[PDB]
Amino acid sequence: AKHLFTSESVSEGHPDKIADQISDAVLDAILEQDPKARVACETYVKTGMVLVGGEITTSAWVDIEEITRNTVREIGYVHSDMGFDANSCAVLSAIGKQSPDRADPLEQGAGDQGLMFGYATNETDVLMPAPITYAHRLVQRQAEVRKNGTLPWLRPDAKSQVTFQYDDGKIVGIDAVVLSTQHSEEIDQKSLQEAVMEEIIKPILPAEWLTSATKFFINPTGRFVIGGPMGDCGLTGRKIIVDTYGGMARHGGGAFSGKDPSKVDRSAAYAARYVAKNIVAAGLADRCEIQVSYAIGVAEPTSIMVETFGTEKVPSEQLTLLVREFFDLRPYGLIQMLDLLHPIYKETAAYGHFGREHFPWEKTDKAQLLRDAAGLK
Amino acid sequence: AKHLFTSESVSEGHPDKIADQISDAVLDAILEQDPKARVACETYVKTGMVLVGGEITTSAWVDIEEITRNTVREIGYVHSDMGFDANSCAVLSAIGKQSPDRADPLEQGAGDQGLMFGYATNETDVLMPAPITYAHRLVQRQAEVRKNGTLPWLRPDAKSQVTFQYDDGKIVGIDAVVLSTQHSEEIDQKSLQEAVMEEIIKPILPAEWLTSATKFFINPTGRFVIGGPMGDCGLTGRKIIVDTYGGMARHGGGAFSGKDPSKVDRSAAYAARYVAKNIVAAGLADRCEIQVSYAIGVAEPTSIMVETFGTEKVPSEQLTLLVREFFDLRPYGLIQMLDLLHPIYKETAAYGHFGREHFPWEKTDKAQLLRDAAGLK
Ligand SMILES: [K+]
Ligand SMILES: [K+]
Ligand SMILES: [K+]
Ligand SMILES: [Mg+2]
Ligand SMILES: [Mg+2]
Ligand SMILES: [Mg+2]
Ligand SMILES: [Mg+2]
């Protein structure tokens, strides 16, 4: 049965992602000196201005302004006519610094309550939903061709959205593609459209999926010349859906960026991705979404729920059985199981936290053990 | 088949909700003078400090500092020992003001791309999921008993989470309840727990649902005395899931607060709630989630998807049929169909945007017409 589904992504240099990237840049910087730092670094950015504000508890000494400017310069906003200059914008910080003051550390309780969801599905090579994968892949391609001289008239800010038609569970093809890229005053729109079509759209979208019917809307309102923080406003924790799964799977509140791994909102979501991905790699189901919840000061999750949507290859209680035997889902367990106390986070902040294989939560190392506990199959 | 599901809510006075409420307070204030104002007002709040920052385009003259202080005073933070004083905190603003510069206005195109989701289900009186309804109802009850002198030792900030067990589609009862409330130094924990149990928990939770087994965790870490912005950080658009449906139904990125109705992220979500709620009130299904998407400069939604999860009482294409005949889903159509150009928004900003009947998107006025177009049934 036909039905269409859509997912959006934005690039590095879309304002809320600038803010995401700076928080995580500060997180890494601290983690490099003090892996057990507690950070919650929220960032706000607007036409003149980056305000990076937080509570931090750490040994580390880190330079917020230096870190802030470097990150805006990598993204590329480096001149007033772009909208924003990394070397002249204002950086304000308001980070309250605290300096650090049960028998098994693995039994320490959750830092806060929360619900968090992880998903996988055999739709893609990376076990992620196809729409959000392609939406991410279009925006990456844009920053790539921008940065490697190919189409050097394009500026940082860009949004993408791809809408997929499915018959029963099966991708059929791509109904509509939208891509809007900031560009210099040098190029104009007809020529721009050729260029994005040749160099961004056609090398990323599987041709089998694109038809005579694929409605492409490249720069629909025309001229996108000033962008980024100029005339707009970005805050960490806004591209929350993009980060995740483009709306295919669910979400509890929580933002990831600027939070160190004590923060279940981040870690438990990463671990839930890891359980679901290992479940589908083991061929226990085709699609799997799990919800995990916690309560403040309790170590055991208050709930685990696995939804294999009528796609299981073992009955479901037997699936929740091995979810528990193979995975330490306690806050400090998570941290152990995925070795998170490391500066790996700025990379997360742009094109999807998930589906990107070299991250600790993407490895399918528990695959077989799950399979051969699932009876043996 | 058993399975547990959880949803979280926070009160007015939880920091990200303070920020939500101030944005919407500014929105209303402008709407009162200029209904066609374009506002996108983002707010950040931290221990000393409220920064309210935006792009606005309007006739209206409005006092941001006055609006900011009044809203913090209604929430109740009015003395340094609470954590934050409305009459002494710093208000900074950075609102760029623009003064206002096709044949059928209903055909004007979408302001941005986006995906947005609406849900309903016959689980509750208000056609909303039971967990997020009760989670909201606990936090309301807290602010209510706080504000009406009953338990006047309690301070603004509070979080709630309720975890529900379901057998097949059917609520069975409440497995765990967590409630953590800020309180004065006057009361201590044993007495506090009685009070929340008597006056907040027991009058809100259906007794039939609570058992010998209901794990209640009231103030699990004990002493919550300073809260709100003190020592923490709130930004608009963070309690995005709470606003919605507690993680039962999906979400595209978008925050609601501080955005005027031109912003599809808000309006289309409100309209999608309205379609799904009218579909279930008409007895066309038991549960209905719809996704709507848009592209910048196009008026027709790029996709509509209806998921009645095997609960339909008419085949599904016939459901999407009447979704289109009964509802103008074009950006300016939405605005017409729900009469949004009015200062009704601050109320939205606290305890759920949905499930609250006196809002334009909650009325089931299209109920019958849907039913008797659905064949006649
Ligand atoms: K954060
Ligand atoms: K958010
Ligand atoms: K907003
Ligand atoms: Mg945004
Ligand atoms: Mg959180
Ligand atoms: Mg928060
Ligand atoms: Mg948006």
UniProtKB/Swiss-Prot annotation, chains A, B:
GO terms for cellular component: cytosol. Changing residue 239 to M: Loss of activity. Modification in protein conformation. Binds 2 divalent ions per subunit. The ions interact primarily with the substrate. Changing residue 233 to A: Decrease in AdoMet synthesis. L-methionine binds at residues 55, 98, 232, 263. It is found in: Cytoplasm. Pathway: Amino-acid biosynthesis; S-adenosyl-L-methionine biosynthesis; S-adenosyl-L-methionine from L-methionine: step 1/1. One of its GO terms (biological process) is one-carbon metabolic process. Keywords: Acetylation, ATP-binding, Cobalt, Cytoplasm, Host-virus interaction, Magnesium, Manganese, Metal-binding, Nucleotide-binding, One-carbon metabolism, Potassium, Transferase. The keyword Coiled coil does not apply. Disulfide bonds: none annotated. ATP binds at residues 14, 157-159, 223-224, 232, 238-239, 255, 259. Induction: AdoMet activates the tripolyphosphatase reaction. Changing residue 42 to Q: Nearly abolishes enzyme activity. Abolishes stimulation of enzyme activity by potassium. Its EC number is 2.5.1.6. Changing residue 265 to N/A: Loss of activity. K(+) binds at residue 42. InterPro entries: ADOMET_SYNTHASE_CS (IPR022631), S-AdoMet_synt_C (IPR022630), S-AdoMet_synt_central (IPR022629), S-AdoMet_synt_N (IPR022628), S-AdoMet_synthetase (IPR002133), S-AdoMet_synthetase_sfam (IPR022636). Homotetramer; dimer of dimers. The active sites are at the interface between subunits; each dimer has two active sites. NCBIfam families: metK (TIGR01034). Belongs to the AdoMet synthase family. HAMAP family: S_AdoMet_synth1 (MF_00086). Catalyzes the formation of S-adenosylmethionine (AdoMet) from methionine and ATP. The overall synthetic reaction is composed of two sequential steps, AdoMet formation and the subsequent tripolyphosphate hydrolysis which occurs prior to release of AdoMet from the enzyme. Is essential for growth. This is S-adenosylmethionine synthase. It comes from Escherichia coli (strain K12).
